[PDB]
Paper text:
The precursor form (pMfa3), but not the mature form of Mfa3, exhibited a high level of expression, could be readily purified and was used for crystallization screening. The pMfa3 construct encompassing residues 23–446 was however recalcitrant to crystallization. Instead, in situ limited proteolysis with α-chymotrypsin yielded rod-like crystals with a maximum diffraction limit of approximately 1.9 Å resolution. The asymmetric unit contained two identical molecules of which the 105 C-terminal residues were truncated due to the protease treatment. The refined Mfa3 model includes residues 33–341 and represents a two-domain protein with an elongated shape, 75 × 35 × 30 Å, similarly to Mfa1 and Mfa2. In Mfa3 the corresponding residues are Leu38, Val40 and Ala42, immediately followed by Arg43, the recognition site for RgpA/B cleavage. The amino acid that is recognized by RgpA/B for cleavage of Mfa3 is Arg4312; it is located at the end of the β1-strand and not exposed on the loop. Similar to the shaft proteins, Mfa3 has a tryptophan, Trp341, located in a pocket formed between the N- and C-domains. As in Mfa1, the tryptophan forms a π-cation stacking with an arginine, Arg189, which is locked in position by Asp62 from the β1β2-loop. Instead, Trp341 is the final residue modelled on Mfa3; the full-length protein comprises an additional 105 residues.
Numbering used by the authors: 34 to 45, 59 to 341
The structure:
């Protein structure tokens, strides 16, 4: 007795485009592949896919992978759930252009997985049952990168350039449990037109919480991500990137971020989060305000 499922998927506008989407479904217990589907947009670029799939009922693990080169071919070498999990765990080198931007034809890798979903009997090919992953209405894809958003609220006349340093070389389609093994060279951020906003992107990067700025065991402070501001005077400022919700201990971002206080930050950069800096460039110093939010 079958199930017809209506799958609605979307990213959680080059940053939002989903050019291809693979769905692979496995029996949660046996690991058998029980359904798969591939979608692509000839163009110009959609952010959502809606489609119907037929499968047998039971307990199912759903895997969604977007914007992976030749994912359709890859699906044939994913025979069972064990293969599928290995595939999700691969360290993949981020396309060089993606530290700067997604493009019209090359979107950010995205994924999502939902385990042990109860798929019940029913639906028809014309009237399918809506797929409700973990009770939600939509499949919500997570980008594998974070967005770095640097805004010069004052003193942009003094700015020569901004670079993202120690970015992870690799992304992973499921969250990282270990620090990066390899690091990308410096990325000069891209100015949004003639505004005072600079952008870049980088893969998720785990940093052990036993480390802090100036105490990583590494002269370059790897694996801590930071951005470097260079002024026309040739002054340089390094701003470590952290993940911190709520009020900053001591009220000043830089001393906290630089590991100068008893409380140390988390330096992990998480996928699909938005790191926003508001910077004032004064003659002899900078001031930095910070927030982290969803993308």
């Amino acid at each position: 007795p079958d199930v017809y499922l209506l799958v609605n998927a979307r990213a959680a506008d080059f940053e939002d485009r989903v050019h291809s989407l693979a769905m692979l479904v496995f029996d949660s217990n046996t690991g058998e592949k029980v359904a798969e589907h591939f979608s692509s947009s000839i163009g110009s670029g959609t952010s959502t896919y809606v489609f119907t799939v037929k499968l047998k009922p039971g307990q199912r693990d759903f895997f969604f992978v977007a914007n992976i080169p030749n994912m359709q071919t890859a699906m044939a070498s994913i025979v069972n759930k064990s293969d599928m999990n290995h595939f999700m765990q691969v360290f993949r080198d981020l396309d060089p252009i993606h530290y700067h931007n997604a493009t019209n034809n090359n979107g950010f890798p995205m994924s999502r997985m939902y385990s042990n979903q109860t798929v019940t009997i029913g639906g028809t090919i014309t009237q399918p049952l809506p797929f409700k992953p973990d009770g939600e209405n939509n499949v919500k894809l997570q980008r594998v990168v974070a967005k770095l958003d640097v805004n010069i609220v004052e003193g942009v006349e003094n700015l020569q350039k901004i670079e993202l340093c120690n970015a992870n070389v690799h992304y992973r389609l499921v969250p990282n449990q270990s620090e990066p093994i390899q690091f990308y060279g410096p990325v000069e951020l891209r100015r949004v037109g003639a505004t005072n906003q600079w952008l870049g992107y980088m893969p998720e990067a785990i940093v052990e919480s036993t480390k802090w700025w100036g105490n990583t065991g590494n002269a370059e402070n790897k694996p801590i991500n930071f951005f470097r501001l260079t002024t026309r005077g040739g002054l340089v400022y390094d701003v470590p990137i952290i993940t911190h919700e709520g009020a900053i201990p001591g009220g000043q971002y830089l001393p906290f971020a630089k590991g100068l206080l008893a409380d140390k930050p988390s330096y992990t950069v998480y996928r699909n989060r938005h790191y926003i800096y508001r910077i004032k460039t004064l003659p002899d110093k900078i001031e930095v305000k910070y927030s982290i939010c969803d993308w």
